[PDB]
């Protein structure tokens, strides 16, 4: 009946190694050396025996209190260990012709993300009393694999940059991270994300403006950081390193609105990136400083002629659909006192308020 | 003029003599893959004529290398009708295309001797 | 001038062809030791051995062409004279990486043998090439190693010996496969397993002694079959011959053969052909499927076959571009044998290429001799693309695949759609001329026979030193030819006429159907064509023509061995210039033969080496073509050894076959070589026959040694049509149609 | 107008059951006459597909002096092309009489060999003409040498 919790035991009761398969593949191939090995092998043979872990434990606790008492020896000692191994020879792989060389790459991801998927997978919910994560001492490995989900969009392909591959990176990083928060010891973390926390982070926001010209190519290394750090919205520990950069490096964000708007800089892609920029930022700063920055904003032959209403108005005709969506999004009423005490204004904001909330929400 | 009406009418009559394949003889096949083939450089001919003719100015001193580039690397398997035949439409080239750009010597001679060459082996 | 033609080659740099100068050196240097070994002299012998050893890396060089003059080049260079101690060891390293890495393949046989003893410096030089190609994509010469290597190890030092140990060492892994595919497929029928192996021992039982450890081991294969189908040999290797027949046969089967180990009697040679025939009839009755197909029916299909590189066998090719096409993947379980020589089994190869591919199984029967000829047919018909005339009329003549895997077995390719006009051109006479009582088994070709004995002394298994008189041979083939062979004249017309639906394509494919007998007719009288009745040429119902599949019997064998007095340039039945309309055209077909004929004359090299290494290289070929015969028919074997007593079929058949190409008309001076044994005024003058009145003396006459284009052909075609010839060889060439 | 089958089958129904019906002899000789009025049209209509299939159609019928009395190869072989050497094979069995008998050349069937050639030859394949020509010219005598 309890499938799992039932069968599981007479096994057991049966055997207890009477389930794992094959033995590694990293020596063997440095004796064969083949191309059928990048089909099966760094395919199926790592990730079949990862996908029976992944369902296995979702089951029953059976990786929790009778996996822990399998083996700490002979045949053992070549399992999920050196699996890991395969995952520090995934990150190196993954970074070292056409199709083949292709499929080398889509392969070395769809791998590679499964088992970020279970390292999450397992974490935030094999180890329930937490004293599992304990068992897996290369927990080095997947720590300085995972986080470069920067460094990853590099080595993995640009390609799935593309191919909706990193329209699941984003929520595989939500996932490990995810496993991150709050469940292990917090000092994981800054092992983890304290190895380039700020320092790049003012250097390379800072330094769109900075760059100017050639900015698209750069705006792709922004827009990673951007992005990346929206995945740190799902994260923890942003709390310690990144409300004192809200206060002041978000409000810097906002800055980076109002120099940049004078100059239109850049193309509608940047024009994009304010979008982002603003978003990742106001999905942590205050509201009070932005709205405050609306009628504060405004009160600070054609080219200062129009200027005088610009300043006044793009900045929320761009920007707009984001602001609406970004105030109306954490709280009503404060809105209103915002509005009213601008005057005048009012009904830009509050036409895109009452009409951009109308279609978001049914 | 004249020269139109009938290469367009025995065009029209290979296209009459393209009806029968069951079982095709290579003469069904390779003698009109080849006549076409003549027939090929005949209309291009025409063409770049009254083009070079009435180009530019003196352009035809510059373009043009575009047809014997194109009539160079035309190839035969076996039958002895190609690598004669072309010689016929190609001399006709000589002469005509030398009487059309008359209306940067020593070029033209190196350029007719590289016609002469390949045209033996 | 050659001097002056070649190294300035490599001193200009841009192009001018290393082969265009290169090989033509290598054909000169070539035929002056040829022509020297002809002869022995002072000057002949000294400015001789200046000339040779020159041409022998040039021919490395310039190995982008075609390659296999080459892969006949290097065991030429080796065996010919002084075989270099250095020289070839390292620039022939350098080669197959220089060249083609797949020029390495290009003398599958060649190597394997070469490796052990053929090479003797290999275990030296070609060890190591064989060894930096060996272990990345070669999986095929993994096939061949394991049947040359195992047979002699002949004398060593230390390295030479345990390298080639290692390398068939891997072959047992990452080839394990190898051997459980072979250990697989070594089926089938019971018969041509005892019947074979008891005439290979038992023709080894009856001379001087020899028969210690020959005797000793010859036992234990059989013993395998019978000693171990339920002892651990084949709980390792089970069948489902070995399931009931090798067990309800290992009751009786132990005692009778226990009893021969220690039998050692030469008169019993002759006695276990009581018990032999007794199982013969009884292991025809079961041949009847259901036993390897089951036993087959076991596929991996695992882990991409746990990588596995095993092809359609022999399907690692010639030319270069070696790109692994094709692949195993699993079989269709139903299985059919059929009604054939060794009783063969269709085999189905489901390929993995979003294609399957039907093979053969012949496990009696060691596919050797016939490789070299298979491969020397696509140099056939891969040489004519460079004659015109070849080209102009589309003239190939189809090839395939010969497998040769295991010394004792190997499997072969299968067109659908190719029949025996035999076959079909007897049911489908059948369906129209009368239900099946026609007149086959009454009174015409049994009525010819017992005529025919009627003639000579007794028995049929003389006539030999009968067959007289020139008027009543006009009589036999006048009766029979006539009546007999315009019956399927009718029936064979009739037979394209009914598969061609349209009333023309009858008509039209009949030029691919001759064009095609055109082709294979030249293809003999470039070699002997024996046990190549008519059921052995058959046709391809497709474009309707005609393909050649038999080779048990090469040049003379065809025609020389006397058990079997056999002589004709190719199979000129009656009932097919029958079915040529009232033609005439066939006399000028003559054509076809002709610029075929010189399309073949004008380079000997190629041809002339690709027949040396062939003739003088396979055992299969005279040190055991006795094996071949004998292994086909009994009457062979008494009669073969006590002809073939300290006499050697190599050399001469070579030269007596390219002296074939240069101008030896009428076949005349082939008829005499053929001759020359048994007996010279009882056949020798009857092959005259053909040659002697006047009508046909045009076949003597014409003969002339001066390199004559259409001569050889003018009378090799009445020299087909002397019915003298067809009436009195065999009763299965059918002559009568 | 492509089932040629029902002009095949309609001189089989034609043909057979004027060999089943009543008397025969006259009317055999009768329905010879008409290889005339198929002749008479090969020499009215030019350039026209079906009267080939007329051909086929002819050859098919059991016989003579439509393979005599035809010149199609002159005309049915302009256009027909592969239809017209079908001719030849029916026409050589009873037409050309003189051929499997061994006769003189002086009776053999004179025409009715060149036709096929000259239609063997405008399909100047790559073994039709080249054979043909040898062949009917073979068919009497000082070829061998001009050969």
Same mark, same amino acid.
């Given at each position: ?362 | ?121 | ?737 | ?57 002819? /050859?098919?019928?059991?016989?003579? #002096? =439509? !393979?005599? $009395?035809? &010149? *199609?190869?002159?005309? +049915? ?10 001719? /030849?094979?029916?026409?050589?069995? #009873? =037409? !050309?009489? $003189?051929? &499997? *008998?061994?006769?003189? +050349? ?17 399909? =100047?394949?790559? $073994? ?20």
């Amino acid at each position: 009946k309890e499938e799992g919790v039932s069968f599981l035991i007479n096994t057991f009761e049966g055997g207890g190694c009477g389930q794992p398969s094959g033995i590694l593949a990293q020596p063997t191939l440095l004796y064969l050396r083949g191309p059928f090995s990048l089909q099966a092998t760094l395919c199926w043979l790592d990730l079949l025996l990862a996908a029976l872990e992944c369902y296995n434990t979702f089951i029953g606790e059976r990786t929790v209190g009778a996996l822990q008492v399998l083996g700490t020896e002979a045949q053992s000692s070549l399992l999920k260990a050196v699996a890991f191994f395969l995952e520090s020879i995934a990150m190196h792989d993954i970074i070292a012709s056409p199709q083949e060389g292709e499929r080398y790459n889509y392969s070395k991801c769809t791998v590679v993300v499964r088992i970020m998927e279970f390292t999450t997978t397992l974490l935030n919910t094999s180890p329930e009393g937490w004293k599992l994560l304990k068992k897996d001492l290369c927990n080095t490995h997947l720590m300085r694999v995972l986080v470069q989900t920067l460094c990853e969009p590099a080595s993995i392909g640009f390609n799935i940059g593309d191919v909706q591959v990193m329209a699941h990176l984003p929520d595989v990083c939500v996932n490990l991270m995810k496993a991150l928060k709050m469940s292990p010891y917090k000092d994981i973390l800054e092992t983890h994300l304290r190895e380039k926390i700020t320092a790049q982070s003012i250097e390379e926001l800072c330094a769109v403006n900075l760059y100017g010209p050639d900015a698209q190519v750069d705006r792709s290394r922004l827009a990673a950081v951007v992005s990346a750090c929206k995945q740190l919205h799902r994260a923890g520990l942003l709390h310690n390193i990144l409300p004192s950069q809200s206060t002041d490096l978000h409000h810097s964000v906002g800055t980076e609105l109002l120099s940049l708007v004078y100059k239109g800089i850049a193309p509608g892609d940047e024009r994009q990136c304010l979008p982002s920029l603003d978003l990742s930022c106001k999905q942590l700063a205050s509201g009070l400083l932005e709205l405050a920055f609306a009628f504060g904003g405004l009160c600070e032959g054609s080219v200062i002629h129009f200027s005088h209403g610009e300043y006044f108005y793009s900045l929320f005709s761009e920007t707009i659909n984001t602001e609406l969506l970004k105030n109306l999004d954490l709280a009503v009423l404060e809105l209103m006192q915002s509005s009213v005490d601008n005057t005048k204004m009012v009904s830009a904001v509050l036409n895109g308020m009452l009409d951009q909330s109308f279609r978001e929400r049914a | 003029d004249r020269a139109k009406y009938y290469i367009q009418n025995g065009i029209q009559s290979f296209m009459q003599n393209y009806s029968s394949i069951d079982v095709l003889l290579h003469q069904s096949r390779l003698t009109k893959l080849q006549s076409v083939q003549a027939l090929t450089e005949i209309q291009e001919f025409i063409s770049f004529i009254s083009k070079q003719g009435n180009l530019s100015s003196q352009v035809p001193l510059k373009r043009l290398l575009n047809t014997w580039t194109n009539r160079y690397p035309d190839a035969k398997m076996d039958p002895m009708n190609i690598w004669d035949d072309i010689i016929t439409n190609r001399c006709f080239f000589l002469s005509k295309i030398e009487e059309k750009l008359t209306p940067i010597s020593s070029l033209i001679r190196s350029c007719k001797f590289s016609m002469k060459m390949k045209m033996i082996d | 001038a050659e001097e002056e033609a070649q190294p300035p080659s490599w001193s200009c740099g841009p192009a001018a062809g290393v082969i265009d100068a290169y090989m033509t050196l290598a054909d000169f240097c070539d035929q002056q030791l040829r022509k020297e070994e002809e002869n022995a002299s002072v000057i002949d012998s000294a400015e001789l051995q200046a000339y040779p050893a020159l041409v022998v890396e040039k021919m490395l060089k310039a190995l982008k062409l075609n390659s296999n003059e080459a892969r006949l080049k290097f065991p030429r260079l080796l065996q010919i004279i002084e075989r270099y101690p250095e020289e070839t060891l390292s620039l022939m390293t350098k080669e197959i990486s220089s060249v083609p890495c797949w020029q390495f393949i290009s003398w599958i046989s060649h190597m394997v043998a070469l490796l052990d003893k053929d090479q003797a410096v290999a275990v030296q030089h070609s060890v190591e090439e064989i060894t930096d190609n060996y272990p990345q994509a070669i999986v095929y010469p993994f096939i061949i190693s394991s049947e040359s290597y195992s047979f002699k190890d002949t004398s060593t030092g230390h390295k030479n010996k345990e390298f080639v140990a290692r390398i068939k060492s891997k072959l047992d892994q990452g080839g394990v496969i190898q051997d459980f595919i072979n250990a697989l497929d070594q089926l089938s029928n019971p018969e041509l397993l005892f019947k074979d192996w008891s005439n290979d021992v038992r023709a080894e039982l009856a001379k001087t002694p020899v028969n210690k450890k020959n005797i000793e081991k010859m036992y234990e294969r059989m013993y395998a079959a019978l000693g171990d189908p339920k002892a651990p040999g084949l709980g390792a290797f089970r069948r489902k011959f070995i399931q009931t027949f090798g067990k309800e046969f290992d009751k009786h089967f132990g005692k009778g053969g226990s009893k021969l180990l220690r039998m050692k009697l030469s008169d019993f040679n002759d006695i276990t052909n009581m018990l032999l025939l007794k199982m013969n009839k009884d292991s025809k009755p079961p041949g009847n499927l259901k036993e390897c197909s089951p036993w087959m029916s076991d596929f991996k299909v695992e882990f991409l076959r746990n990588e596995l590189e095993i092809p359609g066998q022999y399907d690692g090719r010639g030319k270069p571009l070696p790109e692994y096409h094709v692949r195993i993947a699993g079989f269709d379980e139903r299985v059919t044998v059929m009604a054939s020589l060794r009783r063969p089994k269709r085999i189905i190869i489901r390929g993995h290429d979003e294609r399957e591919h039907p093979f053969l199984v012949k496990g009696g029967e060691d596919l050797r001799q016939d490789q070299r000829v298979e491969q020397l047919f696509q140099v056939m018909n891969g040489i004519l693309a460079q004659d015109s005339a070849c080209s102009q009329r589309a003239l190939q003549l189809r090839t395939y695949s010969v497998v040769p895997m295991t010394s004792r077995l190997g499997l072969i390719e299968w067109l659908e759609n190719t029949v025996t006009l035999k076959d079909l051109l007897l049911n489908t006479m059948s369906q129209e001329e009368k239900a099946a009582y026609l007149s086959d088994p009454r009174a015409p070709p049994c009525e010819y026979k017992d005529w025919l004995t009627k003639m000579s002394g007794k028995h049929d298994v003389g006539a030999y030193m009968l067959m007289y008189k020139g008027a009543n041979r006009t009589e036999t083939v006048t009766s029979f030819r006539k009546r007999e062979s315009k019956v399927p004249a009718d029936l064979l017309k009739r037979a394209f006429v009914r598969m061609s639906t349209s009333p023309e394509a009858f008509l039209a494919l009949r030029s691919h159907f001759a064009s095609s007998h055109a082709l294979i007719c030249i293809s003999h009288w470039i070699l002997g064509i024996g046990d190549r009745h008519l059921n052995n040429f058959m046709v391809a119902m497709e474009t309707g023509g005609v393909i050649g599949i038999d080779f048990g019997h090469a040049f003379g064998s065809a025609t020389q061995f006397l058990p079997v007095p056999e002589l004709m340039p190719f199979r000129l039945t009656r009932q097919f210039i029958n079915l040529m309309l009232p033609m005439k055209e066939t006399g000028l077909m003559y054509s076809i033969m002709v610029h075929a004929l010189r399309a073949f004359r004008s380079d000997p090299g190629l041809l002339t080496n690709t027949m040396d290494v062939f003739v003088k290289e396979p055992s299969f070929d005279w040190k055991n073509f006795e094996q071949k015969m004998l292994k086909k028919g009994g009457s062979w074997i008494q009669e073969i050894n006590v002809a073939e007593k300290n006499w050697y079929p190599r050399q001469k058949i070579c030269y007596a076959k390219r002296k074939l190409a240069g101008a030896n008309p009428a076949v005349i001076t082939c008829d005499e070589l053929l001759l020359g044994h048994e007996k010279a005024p009882a056949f020798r003058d009857y092959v005259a026959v053909a040659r002697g009145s006047k009508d046909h003396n045009i076949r003597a006459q014409e003969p002339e040694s001066g390199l004559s284009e259409e001569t050889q052909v003018k009378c090799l075609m009445d020299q087909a049509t002397d019915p003298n010839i067809l009436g009195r060889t065999w009763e299965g060439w059918e002559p009568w149609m | 107008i492509i089932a040629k089958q029902l002009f095949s089958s309609l001189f089989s129904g034609i043909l057979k059951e004027m060999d089943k019906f009543k008397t025969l002899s006259e009317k055999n000789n009768i329905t010879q006459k008409l290889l005339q009025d198929f002749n008479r049209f090969l020499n009215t209509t030019f350039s026209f597909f079906p009267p080939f299939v007329s051909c086929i159609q002819d /050859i098919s019928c059991q016989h003579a #002096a =439509l !393979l005599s $009395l035809d &010149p *199609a190869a002159v005309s +049915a072989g302009c256009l027909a092309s592969l239809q017209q050497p079908v001719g /030849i094979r029916l026409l050589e069995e #009873a =037409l !050309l009489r $003189l051929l &499997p *008998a061994e006769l003189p +050349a002086k009776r053999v069937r004179g025409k009715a060999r060149l036709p096929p050639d000259v239609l063997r030859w405008v399909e =100047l394949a790559k $073994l039709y003409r080249s054979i043909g020509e040898y062949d009917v010219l073979r068919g009497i005598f000082t070829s061998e040498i001009g050969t």
